[PDB]
Amino acid sequence: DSRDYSTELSVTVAVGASLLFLNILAFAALYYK
Amino acid sequence: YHEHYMRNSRAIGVLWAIFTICFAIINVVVFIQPYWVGDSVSTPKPGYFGLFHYCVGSGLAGRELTCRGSFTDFSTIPSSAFKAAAFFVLLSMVLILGCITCFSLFFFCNTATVYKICAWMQLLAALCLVLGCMIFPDGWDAETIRDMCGAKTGKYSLGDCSVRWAYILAIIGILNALILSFLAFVLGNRQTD
Amino acid sequence: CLDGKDCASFFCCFEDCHIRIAKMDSYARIFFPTAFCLFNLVYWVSYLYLG
Ligand SMILES: CCCCCCCC/C=C\CCCCCCCC(=O)O[C@H](COC(=O)CCCCCCCCCCCCCCC)COP(=O)(O)OC[C@@H](O)CO
Ligand SMILES: CCCCCCCC/C=C\CCCCCCCC(=O)O[C@H](COC(=O)CCCCCCCCCCCCCCC)COP(=O)(O)OC[C@@H](O)CO
Ligand SMILES: CCCCCCCCCCCC(=O)OC[C@H](COP(=O)([O-])O)OC(=O)CCCCCCCCCCC
Ligand SMILES: CC(C)CCC[C@@H](C)[C@H]1CC[C@H]2[C@@H]3CC=C4C[C@@H](O)CC[C@]4(C)[C@H]3CC[C@]12C
Ligand SMILES: CCCCCCCCCCCCCCCC(=O)O
Ligand SMILES: CCCCCCCCCC
Ligand SMILES: [Cl-]
Numbered sequence: 001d002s003r004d005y006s007t008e009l010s011v012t013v014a015v016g017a018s019l020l021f022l023n024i025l026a027f028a029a030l031y032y033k
Numbered sequence: 034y035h036e037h038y039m040r041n042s043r044a045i046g047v048l049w050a051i052f053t054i055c056f057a058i059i060n061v062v063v064f065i066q067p068y069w070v071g072d073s074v075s076t077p078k079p080g081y082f083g084l085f086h087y088c089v090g091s092g093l094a095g096r097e098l099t100c101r102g103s104f105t106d107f108s109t110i111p112s113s114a115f116k117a118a119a120f121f122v123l124l125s126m127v128l129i130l131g132c133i134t135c136f137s138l139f140f141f142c143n144t145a146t147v148y149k150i151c152a153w154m155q156l157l158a159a160l161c162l163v164l165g166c167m168i169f170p171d172g173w174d175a176e177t178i179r180d181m182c183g184a185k186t187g188k189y190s191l192g193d194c195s196v197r198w199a200y201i202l203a204i205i206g207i208l209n210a211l212i213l214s215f216l217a218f219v220l221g222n223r224q225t226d
Numbered sequence: 227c228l229d230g231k232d233c234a235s236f237f238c239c240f241e242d243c244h245i246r247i248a249k250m251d252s253y254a255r256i257f258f259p260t261a262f263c264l265f266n267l268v269y270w271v272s273y274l275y276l277g
Contacts, residue, residue, distance in 0.1 A: 020209065
């Protein structure tokens, strides 16, 4: 097995950033009076 | 204007709850899966290890992963730092699952009070995940982890091993937990308006 | 309180909250089954699928 962790890291960072972005969109919704 | 306000609050509360369930799933996954740190090309032996469970290869140009460790059996955990980190991540799990339960309190309890209570547990959940992720590297100097990664490996030093998807997922869990907490606190102070 | 309320006013419920103890049975009637179902879900999933 090719012992490379690049695609896994990329998809993990992608899903983490997406969840973070949805949360920040929620804050934008609230602090937008 | 007021009906728009109520619709926005209700919808964003639903979204919060969905993201809270997602973070609970994330916490369960990072606690269970043993993919916090793992081998590299320069490592003497292959494998991976999480908070308590660790798998290591025999070293004969094949997989042959022997696996040992279990939170139910603290003797098998390599280090006291590993034990403490596992305990803290559990506590975070308990708190987030307790929040999901409290959702049930929305029927009777004051919405504002529930948001706030769920919010504080989500903050502590974040605090305990922070403590766990800070304490877990402390145990890297254990004999088993050194035999896995190399002589360079030590307290707060990767050496030759590399962090795998569960560790960064736990960091993302910390961020999501602190963030979720706030959205709740403000969700609460707002509901009163 | 980025809003500007009091920190306690924005963080804790040191206003009304205890008083609402008569409804504690009403709370428990749905709290305890939810907690047990959640524990069973995580327990069975963890011991069957994830490990
Ligand atoms: C007891 C039944 C009735 C009351 C139940 C009340 C609830 C209590 C909770 C859990 C059990 C209590 C803790 C018991 C722990 C087990 C007993 C214990 O403490 O002994 C030590 C730890 O053992 C071990 O590996 C055990 C290590 C892990 C113990 C904890 C496991 C996870 C518990 C997660 C709970 C979440 C609850 C959530 C509620 C919503 C070992 O010593 P010993 O000299 O043998 O070592 C030498 C070695 O060579 C033995 O192989
Ligand atoms: C696998 C994971 C499984 C997890 C399952 C979790 C489920 C756990 C059990 C029950 C949840 C109970 C939710 C009940 C929500 C009902 C909320 C409701 O009654 O409506 C109003 C809005 O409340 C609110 O904005 C509160 C919003 C509730 C948000 C929490 C519920 C989320 C359910 C979405 C599920 C998604 C699943 C998807 C997973 C992939 C408040 O009423 P009300 O003005 O009259 O009161 C005023 C006062 O004077 C007397 O109550
Ligand atoms: C097996 C269930 C049999 C009973 C059917 C479900 C009961 C639904 C009744 C409607 C809710 C209601 O107003 O009455 C019960 C209480 C409030 O009681 P009261 O003191 O206001 O009269 O209000 C509540 O506490 C909400 C009801 C929560 C029911 C929880 C169901 C889970 C049951 C777990 C066992 C399988
Ligand atoms: C009461 C509600 C709110 C929370 C319940 C928390 C439950 C889900 C927690 C408490 C203790 C936890 C267990 C503790 C230890 C282990 C051993 C590990 O190798 C697999 C996960 C497993 C089996 C955990 C699964 C989840 C668990 C059962
Ligand atoms: C009476 C409703 C209780 C609500 C909680 C439901 C889950 C209870 C636990 C049932 C466990 C029974 C053993 C199942 C074993 C299996 O997976 O086949
Ligand atoms: C897909 C793997 C899901 C693991 C269990 C999730 C439990 C979430 C909190 C109830
Ligand atoms: Cl285990």
